[PDB]
Structures are given as structure tokens and as C-alpha cells.
Amino acid sequence: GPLGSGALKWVLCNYDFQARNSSELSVKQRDVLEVLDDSRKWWKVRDPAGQEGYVPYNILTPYPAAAS
């Protein structure tokens, strides 16, 4: 088959978290966001409205697109 060159790495939230301090951003249990930085516990992500902000990785989870 072909090689491809466009594999993004989204995350699915598992708990809600209100955040508006200065450079933080609120998230919800059904929100889905794309990871921009993972250097520390405060991951940086982009929401579907076009903003950005920091959030703790502990409430975020991978997007394996499968469950049981």
C-alpha cells in the first residue's frame, strides 16, 4: 500500500475541569482535543472552537477508538 504522512494524536477527556486562570482552558467529559505540548504534567491542547490552553494530563486519556 501507500506510505501516508498525516497521523494526528488526539485525546479524549474522562472528567470535566473548569479552568480560566490566565493561560488555562475549561474541558468536558465529551470534549476531544489535539495535543501540542507534553513536556510537563500541564499538557497544552487545542479545542474545536480555535482557542488553546494548559490542563493536567491526569483527567485526559488516549484515543484508541476501541472499548469493551
PQR file with spaces between the fields and no chain letter, atoms N, CA, C, O and H, PARSE charges and radii, in Angstrom:
ATOM       1  N    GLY     1       0.820   -1.232    0.000 -0.4000 1.5000
ATOM       2  CA   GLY     1       0.000    0.000    0.000 -0.0000 2.0000
ATOM       3  C    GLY     1       0.847    1.272    0.000  0.5500 1.7000
ATOM       4  O    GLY     1       2.074    1.191   -0.060 -0.5500 1.4000
ATOM       5  N    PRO     2       0.207    2.456    0.067 -0.5600 1.5000
ATOM       6  CA   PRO     2       0.884    3.753    0.189  0.2800 2.0000
ATOM       7  C    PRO     2       1.495    3.977    1.588  0.5500 1.7000
ATOM       8  O    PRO     2       1.130    3.293    2.544 -0.5500 1.4000
ATOM       9  N    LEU     3       2.423    4.937    1.695 -0.4000 1.5000
ATOM      10  CA   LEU     3       3.111    5.281    2.951 -0.0000 2.0000
ATOM      11  C    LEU     3       2.237    6.102    3.921  0.5500 1.7000
ATOM      12  O    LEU     3       2.175    5.791    5.111 -0.5500 1.4000
ATOM      13  H    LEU     3       2.719    5.492    0.918  0.4000 1.0000
ATOM      14  N    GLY     4       1.565    7.146    3.414 -0.4000 1.5000
ATOM      15  CA   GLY     4       0.910    8.194    4.218 -0.0000 2.0000
ATOM      16  C    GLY     4       1.887    9.109    4.984  0.5500 1.7000
ATOM      17  O    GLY     4       3.052    8.753    5.164 -0.5500 1.4000
ATOM      18  H    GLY     4       1.615    7.398    2.448  0.4000 1.0000
ATOM      19  N    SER     5       1.417   10.277    5.432 -0.4000 1.5000
ATOM      20  CA   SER     5       2.188   11.306    6.176 -0.0000 2.0000
ATOM      21  C    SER     5       1.264   12.348    6.847  0.5500 1.7000
ATOM      22  O    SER     5       1.407   13.545    6.595 -0.5500 1.4000
ATOM      23  H    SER     5       0.471   10.566    5.286  0.4000 1.0000
ATOM      24  N    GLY     6       0.326   11.901    7.692 -0.4000 1.5000
ATOM      25  CA   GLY     6      -0.700   12.771    8.305 -0.0000 2.0000
ATOM      26  C    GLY     6      -1.382   12.218    9.567  0.5500 1.7000
ATOM      27  O    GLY     6      -2.558   12.500    9.798 -0.5500 1.4000
ATOM      28  H    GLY     6       0.210   10.929    7.897  0.4000 1.0000
ATOM      29  N    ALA     7      -0.664   11.440   10.382 -0.4000 1.5000
ATOM      30  CA   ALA     7      -1.181   10.776   11.585 -0.0000 2.0000
ATOM      31  C    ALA     7      -1.195   11.702   12.830  0.5500 1.7000
ATOM      32  O    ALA     7      -0.192   11.806   13.536 -0.5500 1.4000
ATOM      33  H    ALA     7       0.292   11.211   10.194  0.4000 1.0000
ATOM      34  N    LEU     8      -2.330   12.364   13.087 -0.4000 1.5000
ATOM      35  CA   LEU     8      -2.576   13.180   14.294 -0.0000 2.0000
ATOM      36  C    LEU     8      -2.744   12.324   15.572  0.5500 1.7000
ATOM      37  O    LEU     8      -2.960   11.115   15.485 -0.5500 1.4000
ATOM      38  H    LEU     8      -3.145   12.279   12.514  0.4000 1.0000
ATOM      39  N    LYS     9      -2.645   12.959   16.753 -0.4000 1.5000
ATOM      40  CA   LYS     9      -2.655   12.311   18.084 -0.0000 2.0000
ATOM      41  C    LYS     9      -3.558   13.059   19.079  0.5500 1.7000
ATOM      42  O    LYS     9      -3.081   13.752   19.977 -0.5500 1.4000
ATOM      43  H    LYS     9      -2.469   13.941   16.823  0.4000 1.0000
ATOM      44  N    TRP    10      -4.868   12.897   18.892 -0.4000 1.5000
ATOM      45  CA   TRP    10      -5.920   13.452   19.754 -0.0000 2.0000
ATOM      46  C    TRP    10      -6.014   12.741   21.119  0.5500 1.7000
ATOM      47  O    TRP    10      -5.482   11.645   21.295 -0.5500 1.4000
ATOM      48  H    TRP    10      -5.256   12.334   18.162  0.4000 1.0000
ATOM      49  N    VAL    11      -6.696   13.381   22.074 -0.4000 1.5000
ATOM      50  CA   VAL    11      -7.036   12.835   23.402 -0.0000 2.0000
ATOM      51  C    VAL    11      -8.516   13.049   23.722  0.5500 1.7000
ATOM      52  O    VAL    11      -9.095   14.083   23.387 -0.5500 1.4000
ATOM      53  H    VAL    11      -7.128   14.271   21.931  0.4000 1.0000
ATOM      54  N    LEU    12      -9.116   12.052   24.377 -0.4000 1.5000
ATOM      55  CA   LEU    12     -10.493   12.070   24.883 -0.0000 2.0000
ATOM      56  C    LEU    12     -10.440   12.340   26.398  0.5500 1.7000
ATOM      57  O    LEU    12      -9.752   11.623   27.124 -0.5500 1.4000
ATOM      58  H    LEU    12      -8.646   11.213   24.649  0.4000 1.0000
ATOM      59  N    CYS    13     -11.154   13.359   26.876 -0.4000 1.5000
ATOM      60  CA   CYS    13     -11.237   13.666   28.310 -0.0000 2.0000
ATOM      61  C    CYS    13     -12.046   12.591   29.069  0.5500 1.7000
ATOM      62  O    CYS    13     -12.953   11.996   28.487 -0.5500 1.4000
ATOM      63  H    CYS    13     -11.714   13.941   26.286  0.4000 1.0000
ATOM      64  N    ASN    14     -11.740   12.334   30.345 -0.4000 1.5000
ATOM      65  CA   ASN    14     -12.503   11.389   31.184 -0.0000 2.0000
ATOM      66  C    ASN    14     -13.274   12.065   32.332  0.5500 1.7000
ATOM      67  O    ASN    14     -14.168   11.450   32.914 -0.5500 1.4000
ATOM      68  H    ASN    14     -11.003   12.817   30.818  0.4000 1.0000
ATOM      69  N    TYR    15     -12.940   13.318   32.663 -0.4000 1.5000
ATOM      70  CA   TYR    15     -13.583   14.122   33.709 -0.0000 2.0000
ATOM      71  C    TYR    15     -13.624   15.601   33.290  0.5500 1.7000
ATOM      72  O    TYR    15     -12.724   16.065   32.590 -0.5500 1.4000
ATOM      73  H    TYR    15     -12.214   13.817   32.191  0.4000 1.0000
ATOM      74  N    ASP    16     -14.652   16.341   33.710 -0.4000 1.5000
ATOM      75  CA   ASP    16     -14.751   17.790   33.467 -0.0000 2.0000
ATOM      76  C    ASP    16     -13.771   18.575   34.373  0.5500 1.7000
ATOM      77  O    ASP    16     -13.396   18.086   35.439 -0.5500 1.4000
ATOM      78  H    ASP    16     -15.383   15.964   34.279  0.4000 1.0000
ATOM      79  N    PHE    17     -13.360   19.778   33.954 -0.4000 1.5000
ATOM      80  CA   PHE    17     -12.386   20.620   34.658 -0.0000 2.0000
ATOM      81  C    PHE    17     -12.525   22.063   34.171  0.5500 1.7000
ATOM      82  O    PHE    17     -12.073   22.400   33.077 -0.5500 1.4000
ATOM      83  H    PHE    17     -13.665   20.174   33.088  0.4000 1.0000
ATOM      84  N    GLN    18     -13.152   22.910   34.986 -0.4000 1.5000
ATOM      85  CA   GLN    18     -13.271   24.347   34.731 -0.0000 2.0000
ATOM      86  C    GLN    18     -11.935   25.059   35.009  0.5500 1.7000
ATOM      87  O    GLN    18     -11.372   24.921   36.096 -0.5500 1.4000
ATOM      88  H    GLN    18     -13.520   22.637   35.874  0.4000 1.0000
ATOM      89  N    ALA    19     -11.432   25.817   34.027 -0.4000 1.5000
ATOM      90  CA   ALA    19     -10.115   26.458   34.073 -0.0000 2.0000
ATOM      91  C    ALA    19     -10.074   27.748   33.231  0.5500 1.7000
ATOM      92  O    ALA    19     -10.257   27.699   32.015 -0.5500 1.4000
ATOM      93  H    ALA    19     -11.889   25.929   33.144  0.4000 1.0000
ATOM      94  N    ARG    20      -9.834   28.893   33.876 -0.4000 1.5000
ATOM      95  CA   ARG    20      -9.855   30.245   33.267 -0.0000 2.0000
ATOM      96  C    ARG    20      -8.827   31.199   33.903  0.5500 1.7000
ATOM      97  O    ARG    20      -8.943   32.417   33.761 -0.5500 1.4000
ATOM      98  H    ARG    20      -9.685   28.933   34.864  0.4000 1.0000
ATOM      99  N    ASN    21      -7.827   30.648   34.600 -0.4000 1.5000
ATOM     100  CA   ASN    21      -6.903   31.414   35.458 -0.0000 2.0000
ATOM     101  C    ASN    21      -6.152   32.555   34.729  0.5500 1.7000
ATOM     102  O    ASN    21      -6.160   33.695   35.193 -0.5500 1.4000
ATOM     103  H    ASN    21      -7.733   29.659   34.716  0.4000 1.0000
ATOM     104  N    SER    22      -5.510   32.244   33.594 -0.4000 1.5000
ATOM     105  CA   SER    22      -4.776   33.204   32.741 -0.0000 2.0000
ATOM     106  C    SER    22      -4.409   32.606   31.372  0.5500 1.7000
ATOM     107  O    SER    22      -4.607   33.249   30.342 -0.5500 1.4000
ATOM     108  H    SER    22      -5.504   31.318   33.217  0.4000 1.0000
ATOM     109  N    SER    23      -3.875   31.375   31.365 -0.4000 1.5000
ATOM     110  CA   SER    23      -3.500   30.605   30.157 -0.0000 2.0000
ATOM     111  C    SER    23      -4.011   29.147   30.207  0.5500 1.7000
ATOM     112  O    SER    23      -3.556   28.297   29.442 -0.5500 1.4000
ATOM     113  H    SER    23      -3.714   30.853   32.202  0.4000 1.0000
ATOM     114  N    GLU    24      -4.955   28.879   31.112 -0.4000 1.5000
ATOM     115  CA   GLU    24      -5.683   27.612   31.237 -0.0000 2.0000
ATOM     116  C    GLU    24      -7.019   27.675   30.467  0.5500 1.7000
ATOM     117  O    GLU    24      -7.484   28.761   30.121 -0.5500 1.4000
ATOM     118  H    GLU    24      -5.325   29.569   31.733  0.4000 1.0000
ATOM     119  N    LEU    25      -7.627   26.514   30.204 -0.4000 1.5000
ATOM     120  CA   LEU    25      -8.885   26.400   29.455 -0.0000 2.0000
ATOM     121  C    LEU    25      -9.755   25.245   29.972  0.5500 1.7000
ATOM     122  O    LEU    25      -9.269   24.133   30.182 -0.5500 1.4000
ATOM     123  H    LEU    25      -7.249   25.632   30.486  0.4000 1.0000
ATOM     124  N    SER    26     -11.044   25.528   30.172 -0.4000 1.5000
ATOM     125  CA   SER    26     -12.047   24.550   30.597 -0.0000 2.0000
ATOM     126  C    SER    26     -12.203   23.398   29.595  0.5500 1.7000
ATOM     127  O    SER    26     -12.079   23.594   28.386 -0.5500 1.4000
ATOM     128  H    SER    26     -11.439   26.431   30.002  0.4000 1.0000
ATOM     129  N    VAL    27     -12.477   22.199   30.114 -0.4000 1.5000
ATOM     130  CA   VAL    27     -12.751   20.971   29.343 -0.0000 2.0000
ATOM     131  C    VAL    27     -13.909   20.172   29.953  0.5500 1.7000
ATOM     132  O    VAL    27     -14.264   20.364   31.116 -0.5500 1.4000
ATOM     133  H    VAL    27     -12.578   22.040   31.096  0.4000 1.0000
ATOM     134  N    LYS    28     -14.493   19.273   29.151 -0.4000 1.5000
ATOM     135  CA   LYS    28     -15.666   18.448   29.492 -0.0000 2.0000
ATOM     136  C    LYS    28     -15.393   16.975   29.190  0.5500 1.7000
ATOM     137  O    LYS    28     -14.536   16.660   28.365 -0.5500 1.4000
ATOM     138  H    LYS    28     -14.206   19.116   28.206  0.4000 1.0000
ATOM     139  N    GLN    29     -16.116   16.074   29.852 -0.4000 1.5000
ATOM     140  CA   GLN    29     -16.014   14.609   29.707 -0.0000 2.0000
ATOM     141  C    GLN    29     -16.240   14.086   28.270  0.5500 1.7000
ATOM     142  O    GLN    29     -15.816   12.975   27.950 -0.5500 1.4000
ATOM     143  H    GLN    29     -16.813   16.330   30.522  0.4000 1.0000
ATOM     144  N    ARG    30     -16.898   14.872   27.411 -0.4000 1.5000
ATOM     145  CA   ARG    30     -17.167   14.542   25.997 -0.0000 2.0000
ATOM     146  C    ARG    30     -16.391   15.411   25.002  0.5500 1.7000
ATOM     147  O    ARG    30     -16.574   15.268   23.793 -0.5500 1.4000
ATOM     148  H    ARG    30     -17.242   15.774   27.671  0.4000 1.0000
ATOM     149  N    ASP    31     -15.531   16.303   25.488 -0.4000 1.5000
ATOM     150  CA   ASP    31     -14.671   17.122   24.631 -0.0000 2.0000
ATOM     151  C    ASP    31     -13.504   16.284   24.067  0.5500 1.7000
ATOM     152  O    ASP    31     -13.069   15.317   24.693 -0.5500 1.4000
ATOM     153  H    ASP    31     -15.382   16.419   26.470  0.4000 1.0000
ATOM     154  N    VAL    32     -13.009   16.662   22.888 -0.4000 1.5000
ATOM     155  CA   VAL    32     -11.906   15.996   22.179 -0.0000 2.0000
ATOM     156  C    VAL    32     -10.974   17.055   21.588  0.5500 1.7000
ATOM     157  O    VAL    32     -11.410   17.942   20.855 -0.5500 1.4000
ATOM     158  H    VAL    32     -13.362   17.447   22.379  0.4000 1.0000
ATOM     159  N    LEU    33      -9.684   16.947   21.919 -0.4000 1.5000
ATOM     160  CA   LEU    33      -8.680   17.988   21.684 -0.0000 2.0000
ATOM     161  C    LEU    33      -7.364   17.374   21.178  0.5500 1.7000
ATOM     162  O    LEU    33      -7.117   16.184   21.376 -0.5500 1.4000
ATOM     163  H    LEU    33      -9.330   16.226   22.514  0.4000 1.0000
ATOM     164  N    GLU    34      -6.529   18.183   20.529 -0.4000 1.5000
ATOM     165  CA   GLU    34      -5.305   17.724   19.852 -0.0000 2.0000
ATOM     166  C    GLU    34      -4.065   18.283   20.567  0.5500 1.7000
ATOM     167  O    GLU    34      -3.937   19.495   20.740 -0.5500 1.4000
ATOM     168  H    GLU    34      -6.729   19.150   20.368  0.4000 1.0000
ATOM     169  N    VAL    35      -3.158   17.391   20.980 -0.4000 1.5000
ATOM     170  CA   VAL    35      -2.031   17.708   21.874 -0.0000 2.0000
ATOM     171  C    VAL    35      -0.917   18.450   21.128  0.5500 1.7000
ATOM     172  O    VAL    35      -0.482   18.027   20.057 -0.5500 1.4000
ATOM     173  H    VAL    35      -3.262   16.406   20.840  0.4000 1.0000
ATOM     174  N    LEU    36      -0.467   19.561   21.711 -0.4000 1.5000
ATOM     175  CA   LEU    36       0.521   20.489   21.149 -0.0000 2.0000
ATOM     176  C    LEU    36       1.854   20.454   21.916  0.5500 1.7000
ATOM     177  O    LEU    36       2.915   20.650   21.322 -0.5500 1.4000
ATOM     178  H    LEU    36      -0.821   19.905   22.581  0.4000 1.0000
ATOM     179  N    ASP    37       1.799   20.207   23.228 -0.4000 1.5000
ATOM     180  CA   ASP    37       2.961   20.057   24.110 -0.0000 2.0000
ATOM     181  C    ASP    37       2.663   19.061   25.244  0.5500 1.7000
ATOM     182  O    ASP    37       1.571   19.058   25.813 -0.5500 1.4000
ATOM     183  H    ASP    37       0.937   20.049   23.710  0.4000 1.0000
ATOM     184  N    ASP    38       3.653   18.221   25.557 -0.4000 1.5000
ATOM     185  CA   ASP    38       3.604   17.144   26.559 -0.0000 2.0000
ATOM     186  C    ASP    38       4.880   17.089   27.440  0.5500 1.7000
ATOM     187  O    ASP    38       5.145   16.073   28.083 -0.5500 1.4000
ATOM     188  H    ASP    38       4.540   18.223   25.095  0.4000 1.0000
ATOM     189  N    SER    39       5.659   18.182   27.463 -0.4000 1.5000
ATOM     190  CA   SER    39       6.951   18.302   28.164 -0.0000 2.0000
ATOM     191  C    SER    39       6.842   18.171   29.695  0.5500 1.7000
ATOM     192  O    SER    39       7.772   17.694   30.345 -0.5500 1.4000
ATOM     193  H    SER    39       5.443   19.007   26.941  0.4000 1.0000
ATOM     194  N    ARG    40       5.706   18.595   30.265 -0.4000 1.5000
ATOM     195  CA   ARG    40       5.361   18.549   31.698 -0.0000 2.0000
ATOM     196  C    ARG    40       3.913   18.086   31.899  0.5500 1.7000
ATOM     197  O    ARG    40       3.162   17.966   30.932 -0.5500 1.4000
ATOM     198  H    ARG    40       4.950   18.982   29.737  0.4000 1.0000
ATOM     199  N    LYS    41       3.522   17.827   33.153 -0.4000 1.5000
ATOM     200  CA   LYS    41       2.162   17.424   33.585 -0.0000 2.0000
ATOM     201  C    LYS    41       1.012   18.304   33.067  0.5500 1.7000
ATOM     202  O    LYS    41      -0.092   17.803   32.856 -0.5500 1.4000
ATOM     203  H    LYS    41       4.133   17.925   33.938  0.4000 1.0000
ATOM     204  N    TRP    42       1.255   19.599   32.862 -0.4000 1.5000
ATOM     205  CA   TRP    42       0.322   20.519   32.203 -0.0000 2.0000
ATOM     206  C    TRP    42       0.478   20.429   30.677  0.5500 1.7000
ATOM     207  O    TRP    42       1.249   21.184   30.084 -0.5500 1.4000
ATOM     208  H    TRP    42       2.152   20.006   33.034  0.4000 1.0000
ATOM     209  N    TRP    43      -0.255   19.506   30.049 -0.4000 1.5000
ATOM     210  CA   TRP    43      -0.311   19.384   28.588 -0.0000 2.0000
ATOM     211  C    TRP    43      -1.014   20.604   27.979  0.5500 1.7000
ATOM     212  O    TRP    43      -1.940   21.153   28.577 -0.5500 1.4000
ATOM     213  H    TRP    43      -0.881   18.893   30.531  0.4000 1.0000
ATOM     214  N    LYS    44      -0.571   21.024   26.787 -0.4000 1.5000
ATOM     215  CA   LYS    44      -1.214   22.092   26.004 -0.0000 2.0000
ATOM     216  C    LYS    44      -1.982   21.468   24.845  0.5500 1.7000
ATOM     217  O    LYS    44      -1.445   20.627   24.124 -0.5500 1.4000
ATOM     218  H    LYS    44       0.181   20.578   26.302  0.4000 1.0000
ATOM     219  N    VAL    45      -3.233   21.875   24.663 -0.4000 1.5000
ATOM     220  CA   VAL    45      -4.179   21.299   23.692 -0.0000 2.0000
ATOM     221  C    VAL    45      -4.991   22.400   22.995  0.5500 1.7000
ATOM     222  O    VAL    45      -5.076   23.523   23.493 -0.5500 1.4000
ATOM     223  H    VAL    45      -3.669   22.559   25.249  0.4000 1.0000
ATOM     224  N    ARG    46      -5.584   22.070   21.841 -0.4000 1.5000
ATOM     225  CA   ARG    46      -6.443   22.958   21.036 -0.0000 2.0000
ATOM     226  C    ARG    46      -7.847   22.373   20.899  0.5500 1.7000
ATOM     227  O    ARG    46      -8.036   21.284   20.357 -0.5500 1.4000
ATOM     228  H    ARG    46      -5.515   21.158   21.437  0.4000 1.0000
ATOM     229  N    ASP    47      -8.821   23.120   21.402 -0.4000 1.5000
ATOM     230  CA   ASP    47     -10.260   22.853   21.314 -0.0000 2.0000
ATOM     231  C    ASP    47     -10.831   23.125   19.900  0.5500 1.7000
ATOM     232  O    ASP    47     -10.190   23.820   19.111 -0.5500 1.4000
ATOM     233  H    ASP    47      -8.667   24.005   21.843  0.4000 1.0000
ATOM     234  N    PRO    48     -12.025   22.589   19.571 -0.5600 1.5000
ATOM     235  CA   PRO    48     -12.653   22.767   18.258  0.2800 2.0000
ATOM     236  C    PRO    48     -13.154   24.194   17.953  0.5500 1.7000
ATOM     237  O    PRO    48     -13.481   24.479   16.801 -0.5500 1.4000
ATOM     238  N    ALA    49     -13.224   25.093   18.943 -0.4000 1.5000
ATOM     239  CA   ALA    49     -13.602   26.498   18.733 -0.0000 2.0000
ATOM     240  C    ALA    49     -12.424   27.370   18.243  0.5500 1.7000
ATOM     241  O    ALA    49     -12.647   28.464   17.723 -0.5500 1.4000
ATOM     242  H    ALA    49     -12.958   24.861   19.879  0.4000 1.0000
ATOM     243  N    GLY    50     -11.182   26.896   18.404 -0.4000 1.5000
ATOM     244  CA   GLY    50      -9.960   27.518   17.884 -0.0000 2.0000
ATOM     245  C    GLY    50      -9.071   28.187   18.942  0.5500 1.7000
ATOM     246  O    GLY    50      -8.072   28.810   18.582 -0.5500 1.4000
ATOM     247  H    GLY    50     -11.001   26.008   18.827  0.4000 1.0000
ATOM     248  N    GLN    51      -9.405   28.076   20.233 -0.4000 1.5000
ATOM     249  CA   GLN    51      -8.567   28.571   21.331 -0.0000 2.0000
ATOM     250  C    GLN    51      -7.439   27.563   21.670  0.5500 1.7000
ATOM     251  O    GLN    51      -7.299   26.540   20.999 -0.5500 1.4000
ATOM     252  H    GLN    51     -10.217   27.571   20.525  0.4000 1.0000
ATOM     253  N    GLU    52      -6.649   27.859   22.704 -0.4000 1.5000
ATOM     254  CA   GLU    52      -5.670   26.944   23.309 -0.0000 2.0000
ATOM     255  C    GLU    52      -5.619   27.158   24.832  0.5500 1.7000
ATOM     256  O    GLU    52      -6.004   28.220   25.322 -0.5500 1.4000
ATOM     257  H    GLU    52      -6.763   28.689   23.249  0.4000 1.0000
ATOM     258  N    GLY    53      -5.146   26.155   25.574 -0.4000 1.5000
ATOM     259  CA   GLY    53      -4.822   26.307   26.994 -0.0000 2.0000
ATOM     260  C    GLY    53      -4.167   25.080   27.625  0.5500 1.7000
ATOM     261  O    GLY    53      -4.189   23.984   27.065 -0.5500 1.4000
ATOM     262  H    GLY    53      -4.833   25.292   25.177  0.4000 1.0000
ATOM     263  N    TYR    54      -3.586   25.294   28.804 -0.4000 1.5000
ATOM     264  CA   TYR    54      -2.995   24.245   29.635 -0.0000 2.0000
ATOM     265  C    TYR    54      -4.048   23.530   30.502  0.5500 1.7000
ATOM     266  O    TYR    54      -4.988   24.156   30.991 -0.5500 1.4000
ATOM     267  H    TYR    54      -3.568   26.184   29.259  0.4000 1.0000
ATOM     268  N    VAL    55      -3.874   22.216   30.684 -0.4000 1.5000
ATOM     269  CA   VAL    55      -4.686   21.335   31.553 -0.0000 2.0000
ATOM     270  C    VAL    55      -3.839   20.166   32.088  0.5500 1.7000
ATOM     271  O    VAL    55      -2.880   19.773   31.423 -0.5500 1.4000
ATOM     272  H    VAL    55      -3.110   21.708   30.287  0.4000 1.0000
ATOM     273  N    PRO    56      -4.158   19.596   33.268 -0.5600 1.5000
ATOM     274  CA   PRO    56      -3.434   18.441   33.797  0.2800 2.0000
ATOM     275  C    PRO    56      -3.697   17.186   32.949  0.5500 1.7000
ATOM     276  O    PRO    56      -4.846   16.910   32.603 -0.5500 1.4000
ATOM     277  N    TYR    57      -2.650   16.429   32.613 -0.4000 1.5000
ATOM     278  CA   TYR    57      -2.778   15.184   31.838 -0.0000 2.0000
ATOM     279  C    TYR    57      -3.592   14.082   32.547  0.5500 1.7000
ATOM     280  O    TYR    57      -4.102   13.180   31.882 -0.5500 1.4000
ATOM     281  H    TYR    57      -1.716   16.653   32.894  0.4000 1.0000
ATOM     282  N    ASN    58      -3.719   14.142   33.880 -0.4000 1.5000
ATOM     283  CA   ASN    58      -4.376   13.120   34.706 -0.0000 2.0000
ATOM     284  C    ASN    58      -5.877   12.911   34.390  0.5500 1.7000
ATOM     285  O    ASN    58      -6.382   11.799   34.542 -0.5500 1.4000
ATOM     286  H    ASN    58      -3.305   14.875   34.420  0.4000 1.0000
ATOM     287  N    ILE    59      -6.587   13.964   33.957 -0.4000 1.5000
ATOM     288  CA   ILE    59      -8.007   13.898   33.542 -0.0000 2.0000
ATOM     289  C    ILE    59      -8.194   13.567   32.052  0.5500 1.7000
ATOM     290  O    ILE    59      -9.311   13.282   31.620 -0.5500 1.4000
ATOM     291  H    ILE    59      -6.176   14.868   33.834  0.4000 1.0000
ATOM     292  N    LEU    60      -7.113   13.602   31.269 -0.4000 1.5000
ATOM     293  CA   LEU    60      -7.090   13.251   29.849 -0.0000 2.0000
ATOM     294  C    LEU    60      -6.757   11.758   29.686  0.5500 1.7000
ATOM     295  O    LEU    60      -6.144   11.156   30.567 -0.5500 1.4000
ATOM     296  H    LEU    60      -6.206   13.833   31.619  0.4000 1.0000
ATOM     297  N    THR    61      -7.162   11.174   28.562 -0.4000 1.5000
ATOM     298  CA   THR    61      -6.852    9.784   28.194 -0.0000 2.0000
ATOM     299  C    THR    61      -6.590    9.656   26.689  0.5500 1.7000
ATOM     300  O    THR    61      -7.051   10.502   25.923 -0.5500 1.4000
ATOM     301  H    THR    61      -7.661   11.663   27.846  0.4000 1.0000
ATOM     302  N    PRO    62      -5.857    8.615   26.240 -0.5600 1.5000
ATOM     303  CA   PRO    62      -5.628    8.379   24.816  0.2800 2.0000
ATOM     304  C    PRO    62      -6.942    8.137   24.057  0.5500 1.7000
ATOM     305  O    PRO    62      -7.990    7.918   24.664 -0.5500 1.4000
ATOM     306  N    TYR    63      -6.863    8.179   22.726 -0.4000 1.5000
ATOM     307  CA   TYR    63      -7.985    7.917   21.819 -0.0000 2.0000
ATOM     308  C    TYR    63      -7.674    6.666   20.963  0.5500 1.7000
ATOM     309  O    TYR    63      -7.311    6.803   19.795 -0.5500 1.4000
ATOM     310  H    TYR    63      -6.012    8.357   22.233  0.4000 1.0000
ATOM     311  N    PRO    64      -7.814    5.446   21.533 -0.5600 1.5000
ATOM     312  CA   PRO    64      -7.566    4.179   20.834  0.2800 2.0000
ATOM     313  C    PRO    64      -8.697    3.779   19.863  0.5500 1.7000
ATOM     314  O    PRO    64      -8.545    2.816   19.111 -0.5500 1.4000
ATOM     315  N    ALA    65      -9.825    4.508   19.873 -0.4000 1.5000
ATOM     316  CA   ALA    65     -11.032    4.263   19.069 -0.0000 2.0000
ATOM     317  C    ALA    65     -11.654    2.855   19.253  0.5500 1.7000
ATOM     318  O    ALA    65     -12.313    2.345   18.346 -0.5500 1.4000
ATOM     319  H    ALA    65      -9.949    5.290   20.484  0.4000 1.0000
ATOM     320  N    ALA    66     -11.441    2.241   20.423 -0.4000 1.5000
ATOM     321  CA   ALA    66     -11.982    0.938   20.820 -0.0000 2.0000
ATOM     322  C    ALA    66     -12.226    0.866   22.343  0.5500 1.7000
ATOM     323  O    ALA    66     -11.538    1.531   23.119 -0.5500 1.4000
ATOM     324  H    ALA    66     -10.906    2.656   21.159  0.4000 1.0000
ATOM     325  N    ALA    67     -13.206    0.057   22.755 -0.4000 1.5000
ATOM     326  CA   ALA    67     -13.618   -0.156   24.149 -0.0000 2.0000
ATOM     327  C    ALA    67     -14.242   -1.559   24.354  0.5500 1.7000
ATOM     328  O    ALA    67     -14.294   -2.356   23.416 -0.5500 1.4000
ATOM     329  H    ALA    67     -13.765   -0.482   22.126  0.4000 1.0000
ATOM     330  N    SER    68     -14.710   -1.853   25.576 -0.4000 1.5000
ATOM     331  CA   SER    68     -15.304   -3.140   25.993 -0.0000 2.0000
ATOM     332  C    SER    68     -16.534   -2.935   26.887  0.5500 1.7000
ATOM     333  O    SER    68     -17.149   -3.908   27.323 -0.5500 1.4000
ATOM     334  H    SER    68     -14.668   -1.206   26.338  0.4000 1.0000
